[PDB]
Amino acid sequence: GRAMGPLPPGWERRVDNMGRIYYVDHFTRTTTWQRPTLE
Known part of the structure; x- marks a missing residue:
């Protein structure tokens, strides 16, 4: 929940x-x- 729709168990883009x-x-x-x- 940031701005767009979630991401299934595949597309994982976040902060390290x-x-x-x-x-x-x-x-x-x-x-x-x-x-x-x-x-």
Whole structure:
């Protein structure tokens, strides 16, 4: 409950302890929030 609808047991995007917020998955365990740089 923040602004939009909840998120089923898959799309997990929240704050890590007390830093930044990332979109971590539950079925893959991997996360998405960071972007590439070394191009």
